[PDB]
Enzyme design. Structure first.
Site, PDB file in Angstrom:
ATOM      1  N   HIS A 187       6.442  34.581 -61.062  1.00  0.00           N
ATOM      2  CA  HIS A 187       6.284  35.210 -60.560  1.00  0.00           C
ATOM      3  C   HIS A 187       5.327  35.993 -60.775  1.00  0.00           C
ATOM      4  O   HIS A 187       5.086  37.487 -61.271  1.00  0.00           O
ATOM      5  CB  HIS A 187       8.181  35.932 -60.353  1.00  0.00           C
ATOM      6  CG  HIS A 187       8.829  35.389 -60.196  1.00  0.00           C
ATOM      7  ND1 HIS A 187      10.114  35.818 -60.317  1.00  0.00           N
ATOM      8  CD2 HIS A 187       9.081  34.679 -58.759  1.00  0.00           C
ATOM      9  CE1 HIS A 187      10.815  34.756 -59.941  1.00  0.00           C
ATOM     10  NE2 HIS A 187      10.442  34.661 -58.843  1.00  0.00           N
ATOM     11  N   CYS A 196      -9.523  44.695 -52.628  1.00  0.00           N
ATOM     12  CA  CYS A 196     -10.226  43.793 -52.713  1.00  0.00           C
ATOM     13  C   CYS A 196      -9.704  42.273 -53.864  1.00  0.00           C
ATOM     14  O   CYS A 196      -8.424  42.793 -53.707  1.00  0.00           O
ATOM     15  CB  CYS A 196     -11.912  43.946 -52.991  1.00  0.00           C
ATOM     16  SG  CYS A 196     -11.889  43.908 -54.827  1.00  0.00           S
ATOM     17  N   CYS A 199     -14.577  48.731 -55.759  1.00  0.00           N
ATOM     18  CA  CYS A 199     -14.426  49.333 -54.666  1.00  0.00           C
ATOM     19  C   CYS A 199     -13.429  50.853 -54.562  1.00  0.00           C
ATOM     20  O   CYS A 199     -13.765  51.485 -53.516  1.00  0.00           O
ATOM     21  CB  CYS A 199     -13.693  47.974 -53.364  1.00  0.00           C
ATOM     22  SG  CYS A 199     -11.791  47.710 -53.734  1.00  0.00           S
ATOM     23  N   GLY A 243      18.189  30.491 -69.006  1.00  0.00           N
ATOM     24  CA  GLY A 243      17.780  31.945 -69.541  1.00  0.00           C
ATOM     25  C   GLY A 243      18.273  32.320 -67.744  1.00  0.00           C
ATOM     26  O   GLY A 243      16.611  33.338 -67.843  1.00  0.00           O
ATOM     27  N   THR A 244      18.209  32.186 -67.273  1.00  0.00           N
ATOM     28  CA  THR A 244      18.404  31.931 -65.442  1.00  0.00           C
ATOM     29  C   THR A 244      19.484  32.576 -64.654  1.00  0.00           C
ATOM     30  O   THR A 244      20.104  30.996 -64.701  1.00  0.00           O
ATOM     31  CB  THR A 244      17.344  31.715 -64.663  1.00  0.00           C
ATOM     32  OG1 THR A 244      17.046  31.795 -63.581  1.00  0.00           O
ATOM     33  CG2 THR A 244      17.379  30.588 -64.766  1.00  0.00           C
ATOM     34  N   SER A 245      19.511  33.716 -64.403  1.00  0.00           N
ATOM     35  CA  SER A 245      20.891  33.709 -63.165  1.00  0.00           C
ATOM     36  C   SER A 245      21.502  32.952 -62.327  1.00  0.00           C
ATOM     37  O   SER A 245      22.186  33.255 -61.823  1.00  0.00           O
ATOM     38  CB  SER A 245      21.345  35.577 -62.978  1.00  0.00           C
ATOM     39  OG  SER A 245      20.423  35.575 -62.751  1.00  0.00           O
ATOM     40  N   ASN A 286      22.635  28.864 -71.204  1.00  0.00           N
ATOM     41  CA  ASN A 286      23.086  29.848 -70.688  1.00  0.00           C
ATOM     42  C   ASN A 286      24.203  30.293 -71.271  1.00  0.00           C
ATOM     43  O   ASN A 286      25.046  29.038 -71.301  1.00  0.00           O
ATOM     44  CB  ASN A 286      22.380  30.145 -69.303  1.00  0.00           C
ATOM     45  CG  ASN A 286      22.840  31.520 -68.614  1.00  0.00           C
ATOM     46  OD1 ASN A 286      23.774  32.478 -69.065  1.00  0.00           O
ATOM     47  ND2 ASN A 286      21.851  32.005 -67.726  1.00  0.00           N
ATOM     48  N   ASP A 304      25.748  32.563 -70.440  1.00  0.00           N
ATOM     49  CA  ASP A 304      27.294  32.986 -69.136  1.00  0.00           C
ATOM     50  C   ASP A 304      27.075  31.327 -67.711  1.00  0.00           C
ATOM     51  O   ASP A 304      26.053  30.751 -68.417  1.00  0.00           O
ATOM     52  CB  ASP A 304      26.583  34.117 -68.266  1.00  0.00           C
ATOM     53  CG  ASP A 304      26.546  35.472 -68.811  1.00  0.00           C
ATOM     54  OD1 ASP A 304      27.924  35.401 -69.890  1.00  0.00           O
ATOM     55  OD2 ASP A 304      26.108  36.190 -68.454  1.00  0.00           O
ATOM     56  N   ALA A 330      19.108  30.982 -76.217  1.00  0.00           N
ATOM     57  CA  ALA A 330      18.475  29.263 -76.025  1.00  0.00           C
ATOM     58  C   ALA A 330      17.503  29.880 -77.612  1.00  0.00           C
ATOM     59  O   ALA A 330      17.040  28.004 -77.051  1.00  0.00           O
ATOM     60  CB  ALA A 330      17.161  29.839 -74.419  1.00  0.00           C
TER      61      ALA A 330
END
Ligand SMILES: Nc1ncnc2c1ncn2[C@@H]1O[C@H](COP(=O)(O)OP(=O)(O)OC[C@H]2O[C@H](O)[C@H](O)[C@@H]2O)[C@@H](O)[C@H]1O
Ligand SMILES: [Zn+2]
Length: 249
Positions: free
Chosen positions: A116, A127, A148, A185-187, A211, A213, A229
């Site tokens: 990301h 540009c 530019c 660490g990701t949902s 995680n 959760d 983590a």
């Protein structure tokens, strides 16, 4: 933290990892979702999309400059250190992250893929000018391209925008050859990132989820560790390092 888990990791032929905002949480950086999640306080519809940026670039830039300062001033945590060490030991082959912070890099991680984008990167909206910053800009005035003169923007991927093809393709190749993937660490809701661990499983590999959760990925995770983590990875890597050192060679 059983023998099979340690074995799965220590004996892996091509282990990779997919990390999310939770891996940076122990550095004092809030996550996007959950209790004190950024998207629960700030609206992604006004701070995470090209439409919102076009409508009020000053507001969006002020928010990102603030996030940039927070990240640049934060230090890598135990989870970050553990991932770098797992790579140093030759076990972790690639670290795929959805994070826009650079905590993995500052901990020593080398082969990192930023799905990301990165808060370190600033690019032109017109540009192809792009570059990295050492510290956050002050807003106002709006950052303008020195090539530019058009508006500059944070080098991160917003909702509705396409992840860079070469970046996702690289990540795809990594998970296509991985026999084990640590998903920390990701949902597991944002696509296409959330789909990467499925590739590993479909091809016959194992998923190790870390995680506090449970997530949509939990049902197919060979192992799902309910903990932070930092604590989990530190212990995991320490045991893996011990196991490797015990090998008669
Ligand atoms: N100390 C911790 N250790 C491990 N996981 C943690 C910890 N603390 C919180 N978590 C977990 O981190 C997860 C973070 O989920 P998200 O906030 O949705 O972060 P992420 O999955 O990386 O978000 C994906 C994407 O969406 C965002 O809009 C953005 O672009 C981002 O990259 C949660 O499931 C949460 O339980
Ligand atoms: Zn430009």
């Amino acid at each position: 933290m059983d023998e099979k888990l340690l074995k799965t990791i220590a004996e892996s032929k091509y282990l990779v990892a997919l990390t999310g905002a939770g891996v940076s949480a122990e550095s004092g950086i809030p996550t996007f979702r959950g209790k004190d999640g950024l998207w629960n306080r700030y609206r992604p519809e006004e701070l995470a999309n090209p439409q919102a940026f076009a409508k009020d670039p000053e507001k969006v830039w002020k928010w990102y400059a603030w996030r940039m300062e927070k990240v640049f001033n934060a230090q890598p945590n135990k989870a970050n250190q553990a991932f770098a060490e797992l790579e140093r030991l030759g076990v972790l082959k690639c670290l795929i992250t959805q994070n826009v912070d650079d905590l993995h890099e500052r901990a020593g991680s080398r082969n990192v893929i930023h799905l990301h984008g990165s808060l370190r990167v600033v690019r032109c909206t017109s540009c192809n000018n792009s570059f990295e910053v050492e510290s956050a800009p002050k807003i106002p005035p709006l950052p303008k391209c020195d090539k530019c003169g058009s508006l500059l923007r944070p080098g991160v991927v917003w909702f509705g925008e396409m992840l860079p093809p070469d970046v996702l393709d690289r990540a795809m190749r990594e998970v296509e050859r991985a026999d084990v993937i640590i998903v920390a660490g990701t949902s597991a809701v944002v696509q296409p990132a959330a789909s990467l661990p499925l590739i590993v499983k479909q091809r016959g590999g194992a998923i190790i989820e870390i995680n506090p959760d449970e997530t949509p990925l939990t049902p197919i995770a060979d192992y799902s560790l309910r903990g932070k983590a930092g604590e989990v990875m530190d212990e995991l890597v320490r045991h893996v390092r011990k196991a490797l050192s015990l090998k008669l060679n």
